[PDB]
């Protein structure tokens, strides 16, 4: 069984021409391999880009072009757009089976900076009846997808009880994330100040609670 190799990731800026490659472990990639290219967008949504005869489906931009360069299959994106940020998979035909490559993640820089919109939620009265209290800190509409979250109780930092998600895309191309701090109902009743601090690109935005 053949292994199909692609670059793990490529980073580019808008307007740049990039070339992704697809290599076969059994030898040269030929026309008889009918190389296909597929694009994966956030929330596990796949769409076809290039067919077996280098043909594009209706609606796929003309900047996407498939070819054979020497012994490898290749996808050339002539003028990378911000919407081209995705994972690109190549698939090769070997007489009686298809083999997908490992995928190339494409990152497109130069997108506008957007500061995070933070919301801090107190625990429900129903939560406190199970002797547990979860404080939820939601973080939306930020770009770049790098954020650090710090939690404070009365002013003192806590490392125990906190769990934060990795940033992922929203429907509008910006990022979202959430952080949780699980305490006991006793601890919730005992203190008077809880804070969620979300730091993004040097600047810190903070939301607090007071029982």
């Amino acid at each position: 069984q053949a292994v199909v190799t692609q670059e793990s990731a490529l980073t580019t800026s808008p307007g740049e021409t990039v070339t992704l490659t697809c290599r076969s472990s059994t030898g040269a990639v030929t026309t008889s391999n009918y190389a296909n290219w597929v694009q994966e967008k956030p929330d596990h949504l796949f769409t076809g880009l290039i067919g077996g005869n280098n043909n594009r489906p209706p609606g796929v931009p003309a900047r996407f072009s498939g070819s054979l360069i020497g012994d490898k299959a290749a996808l050339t994106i002539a003028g990378t757009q911000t919407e081209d940020e995705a994972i690109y998979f190549c698939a090769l035909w070997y007489s009686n089976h298809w083999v997908f490559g490992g995928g190339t993640r494409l990152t497109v820089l130069g997108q506008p900076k957007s500061s995070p919109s933070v919301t801090l939620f107190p625990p429900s009265s129903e939560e406190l009846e199970t002797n547990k209290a979860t404080l939820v800190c939601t973080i939306t509409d930020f770009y770049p997808g790098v954020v650090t979250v710090d939690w404070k109780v009365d002013g003192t930092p806590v490392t125990q009880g906190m769990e934060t998600t990795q940033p992922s895309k929203q429907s509008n191309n910006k990022y979202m994330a959430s952080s949780y701090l699980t305490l006991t109902a006793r601890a919730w009743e005992r203190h008077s100040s809880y804070s969620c601090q979300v730091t993004h690109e040097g600047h810190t935005v903070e939301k607090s609670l007071s029982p």
Partner: protein
């Protein structure tokens, strides 16, 4: 127009089987081939097999004895059936259409079926309404929430007012709090809408047969 509808979430125990139905519309299975592909949490795409327009099939060598793909042209349904599942078979399984030249590309794909192969205990989620601690200012925006705590396995579906609300909705990725998952969802509505009108969080977890509605009330 073109859609490939996949059957719901599946929890499978090691050594047992998996069955998925891909129901298609906007085209006929007599003209198109339907492929089955998977993506593990820690990998890329793996092709499993295909059923061509003519009824012919092809599979990845290692799957010949454990995987079958068949169809019913009149019902516009393709059936995936795999036996002897193992922990490493945990993945998102997709069916994808592919035509003959000049339509020979994997153009339209199904949304995916989340398959978890585990001998672990299925846990229902504890759904909690999240209202702000402070009352809203006169004529402003309020952000209400919903906590979906401690479930296994993925996924969970969260809607607001049965799907009526969407524009101000944010549903966040799950986190892993010791073998169990936790996510939250929020909806931002005008202060003239809530508490005046009813705002409800609807949560569904297929694997544990739970479907709950939690009304957001003040304080």
């Amino acid at each position: 127009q073109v859609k490939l509808q996949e059957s719901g979430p599946g929890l499978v125990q090691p050594s047992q089987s998996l069955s998925i139905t891909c129901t298609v519309s906007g085209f006929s299975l007599t003209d198109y081939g339907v492929h089955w592909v998977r993506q593990s949490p820690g990998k890329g795409l793996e092709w499993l097999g295909v059923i061509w327009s003519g009824g012919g099939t092809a599979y990845t060598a290692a799957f010949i004895s454990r995987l079958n793909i068949y169809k019913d042209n009149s019902k516009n349904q393709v059936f995936f059936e795999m036996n002897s599942l193992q922990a490493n078979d945990t993945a998102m399984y997709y069916c994808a259409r592919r035509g003959s030249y000049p339509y020979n590309y994997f153009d339209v794909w199904g949304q995916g079926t989340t398959v978890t192969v585990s001998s672990a205990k299925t846990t229902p989620p504890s759904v909690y309404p999240l209202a702000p601690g402070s009352a809203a200012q006169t004529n402003s925006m309020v952000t209400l929430g919903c906590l979906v705590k401690g479930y296994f396995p993925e996924p969970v579906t969260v809607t607001w007012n049965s799907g009526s609300l969407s524009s101000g909705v944010h549903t966040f990725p799950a986190v892993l709090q010791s073998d169990l998952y936790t996510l939250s969802s929020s909806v931002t509505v005008p202060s003239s809408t809530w508490p005046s009108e009813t705002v409800t969080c609807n949560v569904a977890h297929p694997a544990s047969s739970t479907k709950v509605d939690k009304k957001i009330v003040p304080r």
